[PDB]
Amino acid sequence: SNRVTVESKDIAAFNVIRYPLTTDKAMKKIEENNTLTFIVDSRANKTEIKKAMRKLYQVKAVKVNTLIRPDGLKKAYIRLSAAHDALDTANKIGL
Count of residues interacting with another protein (CB under 8 A): 25
Site residues for another protein, window 66-95 (CB under 8 A)?
68-72, 93-95
Asked whether position 88 contacts RNA by CB under 7 A, the answer is no
Among 45, 88, 91, 92, binds RNA (CB under 7 A): 45
The 19-58 site mask, x for binding another protein (CB under 8 A), equals xxxx---------------------------------x--
Task: For CA atoms 45, 46, 48, 52, give the dihedral sign.
Answer: positive
Q: How far lies 5's CA from each of 10, 19, 73, 84, in Å?
A: 15, 27, 28, 38
Q: Which is nearer to another protein, 6 or 82 (CB)?
A: 6
d(CA 65, CA 82): 17
d(CA 23, CA 51): 24
Asked whether position 31 contacts RNA by CB under 7 A, the answer is no
Nearest to 57 by CA among 87, 24, 25: 87
Binding positions for another protein, rule: CB under 8 A = 1-6, 8, 10-11, 14, 17-22, 56, 68-72, 93-95
